[PDB]
Design a binder for this molecule. Structure first.
Ligand SMILES: C[C@H](C[C@@H](C[C@H](C[C@@H](C[C@@H](CCN1CCCC1=O)N1CCCC1=O)N1CCCC1=O)N1CCCC1=O)N1CCCC1=O)N1CCCC1=O
Ligand SMILES: O=C(NCCc1ccncc1)c1[nH]c(Cc2ccccc2C(F)(F)F)nc(=O)c1O
Ligand SMILES: [Mn+2]
Ligand SMILES: [Mn+2]
Length: 180
């Protein structure tokens, strides 16, 4: 079953981002052939974390998302026994060396309020920072500390809205929005 969402994701995202998404889905027992909306979601999430790490300075962020489970953990432990930060209960996305805290990036289709409420209740470990983006343009972070500057986050929102426009122009946005 070859879907339109799959071919659009392959045409829309970076080949390496696509490959990393495929590796993650297959590692967690999911099929990008049929789990197409999830495939698109993890592609957007990967690109957003990569642009996020692109912001800031040179040695600012350590990248956890993208790495496979065991190695991503290994880096989390290295960072913990180096800086002395509480080991998070679940795998985060990045680590800020300048602010000395883990970062859980979030990309949501609906209201940022609901999404951050859910992920903050599911995290509980209030040490790690939370930064939520949305396709419609909103963003919201812990303590209103949006970590990066305004221009990088504006870039991220522009990319998200471009992806949303492409999905809508291919008659694929409605199935994507009702997926989360
Ligand atoms: C370092 C290597 C791979 C990196 C990949 C990651 C993504 C980066 C790609 C670069 C090229 N840019 C920048 C301009 C456009 C582009 O395409 N960006 C950022 C924007 C979107 C994107 O794609 N980055 C960040 C540092 C440089 C680099 O390449 N990754 C993958 C996950 C972990 C990691 O560090 N590593 C490290 C070891 C394993 C591996 O494969
Ligand atoms: O880290 C993450 N997953 C880590 C494990 C994983 C990675 C890739 N594929 C499957 C598993 C992660 N996942 C999501 C979206 C999500 C939320 C709840 C359950 C499942 C998923 C999805 F779609 F990924 F399967 N939003 C984030 O912001 C985020 O950080
Ligand atoms: Mn993650
Ligand atoms: Mn995340």
């Amino acid at each position: 079953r070859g879907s339109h969402m799959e071919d659009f994701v392959r045409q829309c995202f970076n080949p390496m981002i696509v490959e990393l998404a495929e590796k993650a889905m297959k590692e967690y027992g999911e099929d990008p052939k049929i789990e197409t909306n999830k495939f698109a979601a993890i592609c957007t999430h990967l690109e957003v974390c990569f642009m996020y790490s692109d912001g800031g300075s040179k040695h600012r962020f350590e990248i956890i998302e993208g790495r496979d489970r065991i190695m991503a953990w290994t880096v989390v432990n290295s960072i913990c026994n180096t800086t002395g930060v509480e080991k998070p209960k679940f795998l985060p996305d990045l680590y800020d060396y300048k602010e000395n805290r883990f970062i859980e990036i979030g990309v949501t289709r609906r209201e940022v309020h609901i999404y951050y409420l859910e992920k903050a209740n599911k995290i509980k470990s209030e040490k790690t920072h939370i930064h939520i983006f949305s396709f419609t343009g909103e963003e919201m972070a812990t303590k209103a500390d949006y970590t990066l500057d305004e221009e990088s986050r504006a870039r991220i929102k522009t990319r998200l809205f471009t992806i949303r426009q492409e999905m809508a122009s291919r008659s694929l946005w409605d199935s994507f929005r009702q997926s989360e």
